[PDB]
Design an enzyme around this catalytic site. Structure first.
Site, PDB file in Angstrom:
ATOM      1  N   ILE A  11      13.735  29.340 136.871  1.00  0.00           N
ATOM      2  CA  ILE A  11      12.609  30.177 136.469  1.00  0.00           C
ATOM      3  C   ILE A  11      13.046  31.238 135.455  1.00  0.00           C
ATOM      4  CG2 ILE A  11      11.468  29.818 138.705  1.00  0.00           C
ATOM      5  CD1 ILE A  11      12.194  32.620 139.472  1.00  0.00           C
ATOM      6  N   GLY A  12      14.305  31.172 135.037  1.00  0.00           N
ATOM      7  CA  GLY A  12      14.776  31.984 133.931  1.00  0.00           C
ATOM      8  C   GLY A  12      15.321  33.360 134.274  1.00  0.00           C
ATOM      9  N   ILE A  55      21.304  17.512 131.838  1.00  0.00           N
ATOM     10  CA  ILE A  55      22.479  18.144 131.252  1.00  0.00           C
ATOM     11  C   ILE A  55      23.408  17.093 130.633  1.00  0.00           C
ATOM     12  CG2 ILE A  55      24.708  18.692 132.370  1.00  0.00           C
ATOM     13  CD1 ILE A  55      21.612  20.998 132.018  1.00  0.00           C
ATOM     14  N   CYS A  77      24.785  23.128 143.737  1.00  0.00           N
ATOM     15  CA  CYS A  77      25.721  22.344 144.525  1.00  0.00           C
ATOM     16  C   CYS A  77      25.039  21.082 145.028  1.00  0.00           C
ATOM     17  CB  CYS A  77      26.203  23.156 145.703  1.00  0.00           C
ATOM     18  SG  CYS A  77      27.797  22.716 146.377  1.00  0.00           S
ATOM     19  N   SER A  96      26.021  17.412 138.071  1.00  0.00           N
ATOM     20  CA  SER A  96      26.044  17.184 136.639  1.00  0.00           C
ATOM     21  C   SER A  96      27.146  17.997 135.979  1.00  0.00           C
ATOM     22  CB  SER A  96      24.687  17.572 136.055  1.00  0.00           C
ATOM     23  OG  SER A  96      23.669  17.447 137.040  1.00  0.00           O
ATOM     24  N   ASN A 315      16.420  29.836 144.660  1.00  0.00           N
ATOM     25  CA  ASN A 315      17.404  29.199 143.789  1.00  0.00           C
ATOM     26  C   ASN A 315      17.816  30.084 142.614  1.00  0.00           C
ATOM     27  OD1 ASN A 315      17.461  26.726 145.271  1.00  0.00           O
ATOM     28  ND2 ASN A 315      15.601  26.046 144.214  1.00  0.00           N
TER      29      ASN A 315
END
Ligand SMILES: Nc1ncnc2c1ncn2[C@@H]1O[C@H](CSCC[C@H](N)C(=O)O)[C@@H](O)[C@H]1O
Ligand SMILES: [Ca+2]
Length: 331
Positions: A11-12, A55, A77, A96, A315
């Site tokens: 969400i930045g 990514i 993770c 990733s 998160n």
């Protein structure tokens, strides 16, 4: 002056932290594969290049054309293996990060890297490899283990950090191989939670009865509290380990109820009626945003649900801690 690539943008929070730092730079690109998170990100940063992309689809080439010099990243993770077998490299739910460590030697323009990670990363094989790739590419670095409670913020959120930097840029910071537990700057004692609490809070945030059965393992906060437990994505899903609970009642009242509920069957009918009258409620998404030091201009879309909100919030990053590391990384 600085071109930022923001990986696992969520969400930045990174973007919010870059602003708070006062540093000269734009976010030229933010990369995340989560459509809900992206929608929240787009809401607060309509101007910013946001890519729904893996990514691992990111090439040195395309990173080079964007002219990024700075990478901000908080890789989740996620597993590499399930019950004895390697997860697939194009399954969206596999780690990733190994891809990044790989492509580092060909990110010729990238000068500054800041990564947030989980507690315990510093003991991981991945971390050892990641640091090893830094040294190989002539990066200098400092690892941290910071909690917002040392940055004067009343909340626990122990996280790993690495500020990595090219060694040909003069870095005044006196780095060291051992892990730093608190920044050189002292923020004193975290403030209480009164600054960030609303009076007209809707009854929808009141903790439900089924939850009140698990009252024994709740961590309760009050307006005078200078601390709170770490919010996770499972906040309001389960009663426990997921975050703190709040009430407007005096702590003394809370204790009497707990005592009176002790002379009862656990999770029982009479047990619950006593806890029902404590008016225990969850923190609102807005409050959690203020707790995680997001700015007031930052708001969530009303089109996403509460459960989505808490997952996304759980998160994210503490905007203040990263802003402080960004200052250090660029000094
Ligand atoms: N391979 C991948 N490519 C792009 N984004 C990914 C990814 N794997 C996981 N993600 C995203 O990265 C996020 C990590 S949680 C970190 C989010 C961010 N720091 C915030 O402020 O919210 C998750 O939301 C997930 O959607
Ligand atoms: Ca390589």
């Amino acid at each position: 002056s600085h071109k930022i690539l923001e990986l696992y943008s969520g969400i930045g929070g990174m973007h919010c932290a870059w602003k708070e730092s006062g540093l000269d730079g734009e976010i030229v690109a933010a990369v995340d594969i989560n459509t809900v998170a992206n929608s929240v990100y787009k809401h607060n940063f309509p101007e910013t290049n946001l890519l729904n992309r893996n990514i691992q689809q990111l090439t040195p080439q395309v990173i080079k054309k964007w002219n990024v010099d700075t990478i901000l990243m908080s890789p989740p993770c996620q597993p590499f293996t399930r019950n004895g077998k390697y997860l697939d490299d194009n399954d969206p739910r596999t780690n990733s990060f190994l891809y990044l460590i790989g492509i580092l030697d060909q990110l010729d323009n990238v000068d500054y890297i800041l990564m947030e990670n989980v507690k315990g990363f510093e003991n991981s094989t991945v971390r050892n490899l990641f640091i090893d790739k830094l040294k190989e590419c002539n990066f200098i670095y400092q690892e941290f283990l910071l909690c917002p409670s040392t940055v004067g913020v009343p909340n626990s959120r122990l996280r790993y950090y690495c500020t990595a930097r090219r060694n040909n840029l003069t870095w005044p910071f006196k780095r060291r191989d051992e892990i730093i537990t608190r920044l050189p700057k002292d923020f004193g004692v975290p403030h209480s939670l009164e600054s960030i609490i609303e009076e007209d809070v809707d009854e929808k945030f009141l903790v439900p009865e089924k939850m009140l059965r698990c009252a024994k393992v709740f961590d309760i906060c009050y307006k005078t509290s200078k601390r709170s437990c770490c919010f996770t994505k499972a906040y309001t899903h389960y009663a426990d380990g997921t975050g703190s609970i709040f009430t407007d009642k005096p702590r003394e009242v809370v204790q009497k109820c707990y005592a009176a509920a002790a002379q009862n069957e656990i999770g029982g009918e009479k047990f619950v009626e006593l806890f029902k009258e404590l008016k225990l409620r969850y923190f609102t998404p807005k409050e959690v945003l203020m707790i995680m030091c997001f700015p007031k201009s930052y708001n969530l879309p009303t089109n996403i649900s509460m459960k989505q909100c808490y997952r996304l919030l759980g998160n994210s990053v503490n905007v203040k801690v990263i802003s402080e590391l960004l200052k250090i990384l660029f000094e």
